[PDB]
Scaffold this motif. Sequence first.
Motif, PDB file in Angstrom:
ATOM      1  N   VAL A  42      -5.129 -43.441 -19.139  1.00  0.00           N
ATOM      2  CA  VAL A  42      -3.648 -43.407 -19.316  1.00  0.00           C
ATOM      3  C   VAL A  42      -3.060 -44.850 -19.273  1.00  0.00           C
ATOM      4  O   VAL A  42      -3.264 -45.591 -18.307  1.00  0.00           O
ATOM      5  N   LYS A  43      -2.284 -45.181 -20.316  1.00  0.00           N
ATOM      6  CA  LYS A  43      -1.451 -46.408 -20.361  1.00  0.00           C
ATOM      7  C   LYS A  43      -0.055 -46.023 -19.781  1.00  0.00           C
ATOM      8  O   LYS A  43       0.661 -45.212 -20.379  1.00  0.00           O
ATOM      9  N   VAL A  44       0.303 -46.597 -18.624  1.00  0.00           N
ATOM     10  CA  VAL A  44       1.488 -46.137 -17.839  1.00  0.00           C
ATOM     11  C   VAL A  44       2.467 -47.334 -17.662  1.00  0.00           C
ATOM     12  O   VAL A  44       2.107 -48.367 -17.093  1.00  0.00           O
ATOM     13  N   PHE A  45       3.702 -47.170 -18.166  1.00  0.00           N
ATOM     14  CA  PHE A  45       4.700 -48.276 -18.276  1.00  0.00           C
ATOM     15  C   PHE A  45       6.172 -47.723 -18.257  1.00  0.00           C
ATOM     16  O   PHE A  45       6.398 -46.511 -18.188  1.00  0.00           O
ATOM     17  N   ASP A  49      11.881 -52.413 -21.244  1.00  0.00           N
ATOM     18  CA  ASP A  49      11.314 -53.738 -20.923  1.00  0.00           C
ATOM     19  C   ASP A  49       9.771 -53.807 -21.021  1.00  0.00           C
ATOM     20  O   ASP A  49       9.261 -54.706 -21.694  1.00  0.00           O
ATOM     21  N   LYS A  50       9.064 -52.913 -20.300  1.00  0.00           N
ATOM     22  CA  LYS A  50       7.596 -52.951 -20.096  1.00  0.00           C
ATOM     23  C   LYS A  50       7.246 -54.095 -19.106  1.00  0.00           C
ATOM     24  O   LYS A  50       6.707 -55.138 -19.490  1.00  0.00           O
ATOM     25  N   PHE A  71       0.805 -45.556  -9.425  1.00  0.00           N
ATOM     26  CA  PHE A  71       1.242 -46.841 -10.005  1.00  0.00           C
ATOM     27  C   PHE A  71       2.688 -47.141  -9.571  1.00  0.00           C
ATOM     28  O   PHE A  71       3.628 -46.386  -9.831  1.00  0.00           O
ATOM     29  N   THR A  72       2.814 -48.286  -8.907  1.00  0.00           N
ATOM     30  CA  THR A  72       4.045 -48.679  -8.199  1.00  0.00           C
ATOM     31  C   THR A  72       4.737 -49.823  -8.988  1.00  0.00           C
ATOM     32  O   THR A  72       4.122 -50.860  -9.260  1.00  0.00           O
ATOM     33  N   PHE A  73       6.019 -49.618  -9.320  1.00  0.00           N
ATOM     34  CA  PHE A  73       6.832 -50.610 -10.071  1.00  0.00           C
ATOM     35  C   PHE A  73       7.995 -51.038  -9.135  1.00  0.00           C
ATOM     36  O   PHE A  73       8.857 -50.219  -8.799  1.00  0.00           O
ATOM     37  N   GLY A  82      18.801 -46.142 -15.952  1.00  0.00           N
ATOM     38  CA  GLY A  82      18.655 -46.426 -17.386  1.00  0.00           C
ATOM     39  C   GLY A  82      17.232 -46.484 -17.992  1.00  0.00           C
ATOM     40  O   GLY A  82      17.078 -46.212 -19.185  1.00  0.00           O
ATOM     41  N   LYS A  83      16.221 -46.836 -17.181  1.00  0.00           N
ATOM     42  CA  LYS A  83      14.820 -46.995 -17.619  1.00  0.00           C
ATOM     43  C   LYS A  83      14.090 -45.624 -17.752  1.00  0.00           C
ATOM     44  O   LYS A  83      14.321 -44.694 -16.972  1.00  0.00           O
TER      45      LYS A  83
END
Length: 128
Positions: A42-45, A49-50, A71-73, A82-83
């Motif tokens: 999995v590509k997770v974003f 923005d990315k 996965f922590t942002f 908004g994201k």
Amino acid sequence: EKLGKLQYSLDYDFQNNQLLVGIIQAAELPALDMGGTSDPYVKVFLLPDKKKKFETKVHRKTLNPVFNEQFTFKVPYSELGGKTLVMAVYDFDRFSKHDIIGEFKVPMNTVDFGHVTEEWRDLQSAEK
Ligand SMILES: [Ca+2]
Ligand SMILES: [Ca+2]
Ligand SMILES: [Ca+2]
């Protein structure tokens, strides 16, 4: 074509102010190789923005994998609303251009952030 799904468990911790994206498992994915298999990852974003583009461990030769990778942002809540959260499960082809299994997006303004939103969401056919 049986296109399959990805289960997730997504929360926001308000003491640290970070997003949290718990990628659990995918189910019933198409085979995109000449032996009826897939090598899924999995590509997770985040859109638009990315910031921190992630990649899970590749679980080779299965159409039903289990990732278990949170996965922590590190992003504030006024900027998070908004994201829009993207997960795209991909076939790893080791040499050539990697053939996409499928993808879906989830807006943070539709997620009620009390505890954890845990649900099965379906992967729709991408041509990438
Ligand atoms: Ca492939
Ligand atoms: Ca492959
Ligand atoms: Ca390929």
